[PDB]
Design a protein around this ligand. Structure first.
Ligand SMILES: *[C@@H]1O[C@H](CO)[C@@H](O[C@@H]2O[C@H](CO)[C@@H](O[C@@H]3O[C@H](CO)[C@@H](O)[C@H](O[C@H]4O[C@H](CO)[C@@H](O)[C@H](O)[C@@H]4O)[C@@H]3O)[C@H](O)[C@H]2NC(C)=O)[C@H](O)[C@H]1NC(C)=O
Ligand SMILES: *[C@@H]1O[C@H](CO)[C@@H](O[C@@H]2O[C@H](CO)[C@@H](O[C@@H]3O[C@H](CO)[C@@H](O)[C@H](O[C@H]4O[C@H](CO)[C@@H](O)[C@H](O)[C@@H]4O)[C@@H]3O)[C@H](O)[C@H]2NC(C)=O)[C@H](O)[C@H]1NC(C)=O
Ligand SMILES: *[C@@H]1O[C@H](CO)[C@@H](O[C@@H]2O[C@H](CO)[C@@H](O)[C@H](O)[C@H]2NC(C)=O)[C@H](O)[C@H]1NC(C)=O
Ligand SMILES: *[C@@H]1O[C@H](CO)[C@@H](O[C@@H]2O[C@H](CO)[C@@H](O)[C@H](O)[C@H]2NC(C)=O)[C@H](O)[C@H]1NC(C)=O
Ligand SMILES: *[C@@H]1O[C@H](CO)[C@@H](O[C@@H]2O[C@H](CO)[C@@H](O)[C@H](O)[C@H]2NC(C)=O)[C@H](O)[C@H]1NC(C)=O
Ligand SMILES: *[C@@H]1O[C@H](CO)[C@@H](O[C@@H]2O[C@H](CO)[C@@H](O)[C@H](O)[C@H]2NC(C)=O)[C@H](O)[C@H]1NC(C)=O
Ligand SMILES: *[C@@H]1O[C@H](CO)[C@@H](O[C@@H]2O[C@H](CO)[C@@H](O)[C@H](O)[C@H]2NC(C)=O)[C@H](O)[C@H]1NC(C)=O
Ligand SMILES: *[C@@H]1O[C@H](CO)[C@@H](O[C@@H]2O[C@H](CO)[C@@H](O)[C@H](O)[C@H]2NC(C)=O)[C@H](O)[C@H]1NC(C)=O
Ligand SMILES: *[C@@H]1O[C@H](CO)[C@@H](O[C@@H]2O[C@H](CO)[C@@H](O)[C@H](O)[C@H]2NC(C)=O)[C@H](O)[C@H]1NC(C)=O
Ligand SMILES: *[C@@H]1O[C@H](CO)[C@@H](O[C@@H]2O[C@H](CO)[C@@H](O)[C@H](O)[C@H]2NC(C)=O)[C@H](O)[C@H]1NC(C)=O
Ligand SMILES: *[C@@H]1O[C@H](CO)[C@@H](O)[C@H](O)[C@H]1NC(C)=O
Ligand SMILES: *[C@@H]1O[C@H](CO)[C@@H](O)[C@H](O)[C@H]1NC(C)=O
Ligand SMILES: *[C@@H]1O[C@H](CO)[C@@H](O)[C@H](O)[C@H]1NC(C)=O
Ligand SMILES: *[C@@H]1O[C@H](CO)[C@@H](O)[C@H](O)[C@H]1NC(C)=O
Ligand SMILES: *[C@@H]1O[C@H](CO)[C@@H](O)[C@H](O)[C@H]1NC(C)=O
Ligand SMILES: *[C@@H]1O[C@H](CO)[C@@H](O)[C@H](O)[C@H]1NC(C)=O
Ligand SMILES: *[C@@H]1O[C@H](CO)[C@@H](O)[C@H](O)[C@H]1NC(C)=O
Ligand SMILES: *[C@@H]1O[C@H](CO)[C@@H](O)[C@H](O)[C@H]1NC(C)=O
Ligand SMILES: *[C@@H]1O[C@H](CO)[C@@H](O)[C@H](O)[C@H]1NC(C)=O
Ligand SMILES: *[C@@H]1O[C@H](CO)[C@@H](O)[C@H](O)[C@H]1NC(C)=O
Ligand SMILES: *[C@@H]1O[C@H](CO)[C@@H](O)[C@H](O)[C@H]1NC(C)=O
Ligand SMILES: *[C@@H]1O[C@H](CO)[C@@H](O)[C@H](O)[C@H]1NC(C)=O
Ligand SMILES: *[C@@H]1O[C@H](CO)[C@@H](O)[C@H](O)[C@H]1NC(C)=O
Ligand SMILES: *[C@@H]1O[C@H](CO)[C@@H](O)[C@H](O)[C@H]1NC(C)=O
Ligand SMILES: *[C@@H]1O[C@H](CO)[C@@H](O)[C@H](O)[C@H]1NC(C)=O
Ligand SMILES: *[C@@H]1O[C@H](CO)[C@@H](O)[C@H](O)[C@H]1NC(C)=O
Ligand SMILES: *[C@@H]1O[C@H](CO)[C@@H](O)[C@H](O)[C@H]1NC(C)=O
Ligand SMILES: *[C@@H]1O[C@H](CO)[C@@H](O)[C@H](O)[C@H]1NC(C)=O
Ligand SMILES: *[C@@H]1O[C@H](CO)[C@@H](O)[C@H](O)[C@H]1NC(C)=O
Lengths: 451, 125, 104, 125, 451, 125
């Protein structure tokens, strides 16, 4: 009656894990001599990419078990590492530093942040030495001894050696598109209310993901995607407090950041072909770095987040926002890098609200040059100073939060900003993507018989 | 080439059996360079394994291939309209996943080597 | 080198009309190698045409040129006020004498 | 193997259609090692793409393959002697380069899937 | 009437760019422990290579847009770099040098070229030091200060660090054959009067190119191929003076080069496993290096070049040869390396002639040990001295020229030797080769119909 | 998959001609990663070369393939029982090793291109 008929090219797939390859704009590669996140390891992108709607297809997605996020983590860290191998290693700079206060033009907030430090340094000739001065930040220098000798050491020098970023290499995140090799497909959830888990009734297949900028930040997702309809609350388990809650804004909050100091860059020769760039002298008055957010915009977005949180924690629960309990500087402050300078902003103003069931904010930011990226101990880098005044505009497109546990009373829920792991920063963009394996061989009954 | 890829994954099995070339054309394409080379080489090996399976069934160069293997109702007792006009290939693969190797071994060695030996012995006549 | 003669020495027109500046190469073999440069007074020259006919990046479309062999010409379609300068033709290292476009 | 390679590239198309095996046999074979591996893998992928194109036209294992696709005089209105006894394949490829994809899409999906469905439905009888 | 017939294996090709792989003699690899241009990255060559004549085929060649030349450039530079990574880096030698004149047995021309220089040096034990002396060339040492302290520094030390070539690694150019991967062919122009551009009516296909020796030189092409019939003049545009003119001789000019000094090699230990080899002491009299060319042979070849130049610049034009206007030592002199020693010859005698329309020459050469190859700033190498007297025979098979511009009078044309870029040295051997892609799938009308 | 691999290497040629799929399925699969990638790519290229040889003989998708090439007693004058019931394929390969290329050139170009041209000219009728 019925016989086996073999079909090749059937639209059947299974969940799979593969090694994806990027796609990037060749244009920006011509504009960008080098970018830490290499466009050379990657490939030029294809204009007019294709997205086919898989009508009548409902696919199961898991934002919290996605290997695209892990591959992105591996790729970004490895791209950073190879972008920092050729650059100069600042081992000769691990010397005693005689440091004194800088009080030329200082406001009461910036008192003691910068120090004038003198030290003996190597020169291009191995038989001669020089005494050179540079300004250093309090966060990059540690007292050598308890006694007030005013002798200082760089924080890394005990545990590790600190590389210097090449001055030519740029830090601007450029979009990268993650593409699937032959025999694999990327399925994109087109549902506008999806929380990253469970069945997705609106699915499409894409050659490559949308351009994702590797923006490294804590407590606030910058320059990311925005929710189409409503603020999106996404946690692996919302009841669990050990899992960070990722918030997506439907409307961004514009944030204006600046370091008003007019900085200079001083070349110091430490070897035959090796240079060390230093802070030089700050032309003009010295004022603290800070960031401005619109207060009304922040309050309206916070109300929207409160409404979405109430959808998960009760209709009469009190949603309180408070600031970080503690930890390293990266997590306790809104850490980010824009222009090549690494900022650290106190977001206590941002999270200072109790929401009962019924003009700008200025954030004092701090600057550092010794940066330990990606929660690794022993691989610090020195950020060369950026010359001039830096002004900086970004969109706050989301939050990373942690809910306080052990609540004695059940009417309130406290949420504090968090971060530090960028797998939860890059999972807020890849939440709607899953890679699948095509199984093109099928066998089905038909009445047809081989002669 | 990519246009229409997987676009009949929510269509009936019969409607999806008319777009097989779209999915057949989409199966072939520093440390990063070796990772991508390993991906490309595995895609090539996978295509070759599928084509070898087709070739050991007398199904070379064929996207639809009939055989001399009777269907067993133990594998599936559904009627032709249910399968071809009321099911998708994904649901079908979910249903037959635990019977695939039995069919593949009834195609691998019984049917093809028997048929091939008989063609040789008929070519003798 | 290649002699370039860029006639006329002085060309008097008025705005908005089409001027046809011409350069004639003499000691050449004949190819599409020419450039047209605009030099306003007090300023360094600026490249308009790079090739027999192509246009330098950023230059408006009113500046266009053509030619081949040993006769080439620059055609300013619309003599806008910011289009009166000295125009030069270049064949490798040789330069023209210069054509004055002056208001009249 | 290499002997005679491309030796009928200045011969007529018909004379050059008798040496196809010579050119078919010549299509298959540190940081330098990965560059050469990438070259070899791209050669393999290219051969596989060509063979896949042949297979989706019902032309597997065939160096000459006839089809059911009529020739359009819009593609070329030349007479058979002009093409086969008075032209080379290079000139031919120059002439038809802007019509190749139309022919390849008339072979890809129309002719082969139509024919293949009809063989299945005749095997039903 | 007519139907589509598919043909696989048709002899159709297009111009393409691929990654070629070398071929070399296994024999010489057994004789050569190591050669900078690795026979290990490459492959053993095939005896009795095949060349099929493509009768009735006329192919378009462009000598001036050929990616084989660019790949050869990349390959030779990269082979040099990896051959110099393992060898010792002479950073400890960047010290003040107290230098005095060497006047033991000195001719008036060689006055001051070599200097006796003393310096403090590291030893295998990190806690002890030694004072060591070595002879250095004036071109490798620079005054530290204007005042006559007689303190000197190596020229590289300010800008970069200087590697030392391993003494075992050899510098003799061995022929390499460039082969095409599967699905690609190399088409060879067999026309004897071809100028490297335009249609070539006599074409052949070759598995691999002929053996090309990576000879690095300026102003004169050495040990290359020779024109079959007549001297060949090849420029991208002969009227353009910014493009170098490549000359091919039909008969070579034998050139005999020598450094008559009996040199010695002195081992100096600078580290636990690192050695520095120095000039030692020169046994016997010291005389300048020089090169001899036959004067009659040079004059006849120059007349032939003049005739070919007259074919491009007029039948009554005066062809004048003059010497280099200026530049770095590499371009101003005939730079070459034979035996491991790097020579720099003043070719003012070679180009000293005016040709109106109607015994040996000795070239004073100079020696260097700090060599900046391939027009790169920052990657110098130290050439270890070669022990003994070196005698050296080569064939001058061509020239690299530049025609003077701005000629006030049109009756004369001046040509000066040039070089520096080896892409114009390796393009004089690959001028007759183009890589093509085979397109084996063809569709043609026939009257045959599928049943 | 590996089960039964080479298990008929001491069996007669006929008994060993009934297990060809077992050996056909076993032909396809840092600095160490590139060495293993080179091994895998060479296995792929080798399989492709063998399949190309089969395809230029009219033997695509066929583990046993008859031809129109007469056997020459110069190659081997043994009787059918000796070969198929009293010899193994290893001994056979030892015997015919110096005649393989003659057979492969009588299959490569004579038989297949002749037959293929005749099918084209019969399809004309
Ligand atoms: C979020 O996105 C915004 C908008 O894209 C982004 O702000 C932009 O950052 C770039 C890069 O930091 C800024 O461009 C810089 O500023 C000026 C403007 O041209 C130039 O001085 C800079 O060039 C210097 O630095 C280069 C090295 O990076 C050198 O190659 C060059 O020679 C110069 O020395 C540089 O282009 C741009 O102005 C801002 N735009 C705005 C509107 O603020 C922001 O950084 C993103 N935020 C995060 C957290 O990633
Ligand atoms: C153009 O081609 C000519 C002819 O091929 C070429 O001249 C030859 O160069 C080689 C290599 O420099 C010379 O051989 C050297 O000389 C003697 C002869 O055997 C030996 O002392 C040398 O061996 C020593 O050096 C080796 C390292 O290179 C060590 O491995 C070895 O142990 C020895 O220490 C070496 O073989 C050869 O004599 C000349 N031949 C002639 C006729 O001059 C010339 O160099 C080429 N020119 C250019 C510019 O490339
Ligand atoms: C940091 O202290 C240094 C001293 O090491 C200051 O540099 C000196 O500045 C004076 C002007 O007051 C100059 O005359 C000296 O020549 C400088 N010293 C040297 C060695 O050249 C420097 O001004 C201080 N910087 C700041 C920002 O306070
Ligand atoms: C995301 O939405 C889905 C679907 O509404 C939610 O899944 C439901 O909740 C639990 C899992 O938490 C399971 O019982 C079922 O998968 C779903 N139940 C239904 C449809 O009755 C999922 O919880 C949502 N997640 C968040 C963080 O809101
Ligand atoms: C951030 O906000 C502060 C406070 O409003 C801004 O400081 C003012 O800046 C303007 C413009 O330069 C000055 O005229 C005012 O005197 C400042 N007011 C103060 C200190 O109270 C600051 O410019 C903003 N920074 C940005 C947008 O980068
Ligand atoms: C966080 O909010 C508290 C109030 O909840 C702020 O403290 C008050 O600030 C107002 C306005 O400056 C003062 O009048 C009050 O005296 C402050 N104390 C209290 C107990 O209300 C506090 O400044 C906010 N923190 C920020 C912006 O970092
Ligand atoms: C270079 O100068 C050095 C001195 O540093 C000379 O070496 C000395 O030579 C004398 C013979 O005149 C020996 O007695 C000494 O023992 C040597 N010095 C040492 C430290 O051993 C050397 O002769 C000079 N070289 C040249 C080529 O003139
Ligand atoms: C090389 O020879 C060719 C053919 O003789 C020359 O090409 C001619 O010259 C120009 C290009 O310079 C073009 O008009 C044509 O391609 C050719 N014209 C003809 C055949 O009339 C080419 O110029 C020669 N190059 C050199 C340097 O001598
Ligand atoms: C280059 O030519 C010069 C000048 O002819 C040669 O110098 C002569 O060499 C011979 C043989 O050794 C000596 O007997 C003569 O005294 C030298 N004559 C001079 C200096 O006038 C030199 O040998 C040649 N060099 C080569 C071929 O390497
Ligand atoms: C280049 O040629 C000039 C002549 O054009 C040479 O200079 C003459 O050399 C001869 C023979 O040695 C002397 O008699 C003349 O007095 C020199 N001067 C002039 C003005 O003719 C010159 O030596 C040559 N240069 C070389 C070989 O480097
Ligand atoms: C630098 O060296 C001098 C002597 O050269 C020494 O007295 C001084 O303490 C050193 N300075 C430091 C370690 O800051
Ligand atoms: C910020 O948001 C606005 C409004 O959606 C958008 O147009 C703009 O491109 C965003 N900027 C960045 C840097 O993402
Ligand atoms: C910063 O200093 C530079 C140095 O000349 C000056 O040109 C520039 O105007 C200064 N900028 C500000 C904002 O003071
Ligand atoms: C959080 O806010 C408190 C005041 O409520 C402040 O004392 C503390 O320093 C803040 N913590 C961090 C990590 O910024
Ligand atoms: C934000 O709105 C909420 C409403 O509960 C309340 O905290 C407050 O009025 C607003 N705060 C600011 C700073 O505008
Ligand atoms: C989806 O299903 C509907 C009805 O169930 C049908 O009309 C439509 O053609 C289907 N579309 C696809 C792409 O399968
Ligand atoms: C169908 O499968 C059953 C086992 O489920 C087996 O006993 C039976 O023989 C099979 N039928 C045929 C016709 O092979
Ligand atoms: C096929 O898969 C599972 C896993 O072995 C098996 O237990 C089950 O009976 C089958 N499922 C269906 C839906 O036939
Ligand atoms: C070349 O053409 C001539 C006549 O045009 C012909 O006799 C000869 O066979 C051709 N040779 C090749 C190799 O095509
Ligand atoms: C031939 O091509 C033309 C377009 O050039 C088209 O209109 C016509 O239908 C084609 N003929 C056939 C028989 O398909
Ligand atoms: C085929 O190629 C070009 C490029 O599109 C096209 O314009 C031209 O008409 C065709 N050429 C010939 C010779 O048929
Ligand atoms: C070498 O060191 C000594 C002392 O050990 C010193 O006096 C002398 O100047 C140094 N020589 C140099 C730098 O040439
Ligand atoms: C030099 O030229 C002669 C004559 O052509 C030739 O025999 C010899 O091999 C050439 N030598 C070199 C080293 O190229
Ligand atoms: C060079 O010196 C060595 C050292 O012994 C000697 O054997 C050789 O003969 C010398 N050569 C010449 C040409 O003087
Ligand atoms: C070129 O020759 C002149 C004499 O005509 C001489 O002074 C000059 O140094 C030479 N230039 C070079 C670079 O050798
Ligand atoms: C070379 O011949 C030319 C003929 O014009 C002339 O310069 C001279 O007589 C000859 N020169 C030498 C050095 O032999
Ligand atoms: C081995 O040979 C014996 C007798 O020679 C035969 O019975 C047996 O089947 C053979 N076994 C194999 C595995 O070939
Ligand atoms: C068999 O081979 C011999 C050479 O050993 C040859 O002469 C003979 O023609 C061949 N027989 C056939 C039928 O091809
Ligand atoms: C086959 O191989 C060898 C090697 O060429 C040959 O000499 C011999 O005659 C043949 N051996 C047999 C056993 O037929």
């Amino acid at each position: 009656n019925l016989w086996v008929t073999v079909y090749y090219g059937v639209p059947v797939w299974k969940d799979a894990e593969t090694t994806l390859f990027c796609a990037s704009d060749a244009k920006a590669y011509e504009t960008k001599k080098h970018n830490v996140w290499a466009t050379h390891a990657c490939v030029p992108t294809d204009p007019n990419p294709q997205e086919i709607h898989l009508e009548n297809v409902t696919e199961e997605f898991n934002m919290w078990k996605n290997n695209m996020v892990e591959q992105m983590h591996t790729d970004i860290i490895s791209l950073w590492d190879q972008s920092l191998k050729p650059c100069v290693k600042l081992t000769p700079l691990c010397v005693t530093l005689q440091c004194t206060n800088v009080t030329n033009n200082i406001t009461d907030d910036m008192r003691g942040e910068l120090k004038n430090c003198s030290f003996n340094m190597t020169t291009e000739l191995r038989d001669k030495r020089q005494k050179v001065h540079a300004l250093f930040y309090k966060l990059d220098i540690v007292p050598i001894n308890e006694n007030q000798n005013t002798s200082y050491r760089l924080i890394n020098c005990n545990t590790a050696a600190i590389t210097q970023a090449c001055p030519k290499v740029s830090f601007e995140p450029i979009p990268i598109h993650y593409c699937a090799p032959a025999g694999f497909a990327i399925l994109k959830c087109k549902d506008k209310k999806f929380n990253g888990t469970g069945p997705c009734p609106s699915v499409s297949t894409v050659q490559c993901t949308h351009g994702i900028k590797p923006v490294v930040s804590t407590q606030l997702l910058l320059n990311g995607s925005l929710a189409e309809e409503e603020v999106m609350i996404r946690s692996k388990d919302i009841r669990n407090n050990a899992k960070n809650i990722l918030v997506q804004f439907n409307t961004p909050v514009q944030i204006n950041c600046t370091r008003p100091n007019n900085n200079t860059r001083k070349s110091i020769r430490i070897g035959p072909g090796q240079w060390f760039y230093a802070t030089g002298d700050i032309i003009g008055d010295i004022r603290q770095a800070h960031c401005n957010v619109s207060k009304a915009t922040w309050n309206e977005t916070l109300g929207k987040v409160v409404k979405q949180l109430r959808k998960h924690f009760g209709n009469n629960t009190i949603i309180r926002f408070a600031n970080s309990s503690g930890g390293d500087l990266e997590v306790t402050t809104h850490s980010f890098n824009c222009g090549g300078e690494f900022f650290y902003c106190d977001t206590s103003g941002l999270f200072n609200s109790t929401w009962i069931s019924n003009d700008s904010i200025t954030l004092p930011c701090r600057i550092k040059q010794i940066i330990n990226m990606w929660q690794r101990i022993g691989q610090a880098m020195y950020a060369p100073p950026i010359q001039g005044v830096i002004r900086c505009v970004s969109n706050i497109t989301g939050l990373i939060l942690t809910r306080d546990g052990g609540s004695t009373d059940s009417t309130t829920e406290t949420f504090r900003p968090s971060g530090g792991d960028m797998r939860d920063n890059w999972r807020s963009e890849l939440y709607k993507y899953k890679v699948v394996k095509i199984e093109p061989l099928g066998v089905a009954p038909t009445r047809c018989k081989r002669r | 080439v990519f246009l229409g890829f997987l676009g009949a994954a929510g269509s009936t099995m019969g409607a999806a059996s008319m777009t097989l070339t779209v999915q057949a054309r989409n199966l072939l394409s520093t440390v990063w360079g070796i990772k991508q080379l390993q991906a490309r080489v595995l895609a090539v090996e996978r295509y070759l394994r599928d084509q070898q399976l087709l070739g050991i069934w007398g199904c070379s160069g064929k996207l639809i291939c009939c055989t001399n293997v009777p269907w067993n109702s133990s594998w599936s007792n559904r009627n032709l309209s249910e399968i071809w006009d009321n099911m998708t290939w994904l649901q079908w693969d979910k249903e037959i996943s635990n019977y695939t190797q039995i069919i593949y071994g009834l195609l691998e060695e019984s049917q093809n080597q028997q048929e091939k030996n008989e063609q040789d012995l008929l070519a003798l006549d | 080198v290649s002699v370039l003669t860029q006639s006329p020495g002085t060309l008097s027109l008025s705005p908005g009309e089409r001027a046809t500046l011409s350069c004639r190469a003499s000691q050449t073999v004949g190819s599409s190698y020419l450039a047209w440069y605009q030099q306003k007074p007090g300023q360094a020259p600026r490249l308009l045409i790079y090739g027999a006919s192509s246009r330098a990046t950023g230059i408006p479309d009113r500046f266009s040129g053509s030619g081949s062999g040993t006769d080439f010409t620059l055609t300013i379609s619309r003599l806008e006020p910011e289009d009166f300068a000295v125009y030069y033709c270049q064949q490798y290292e040789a330069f023209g004498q210069g054509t004055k476009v002056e208001i009249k």
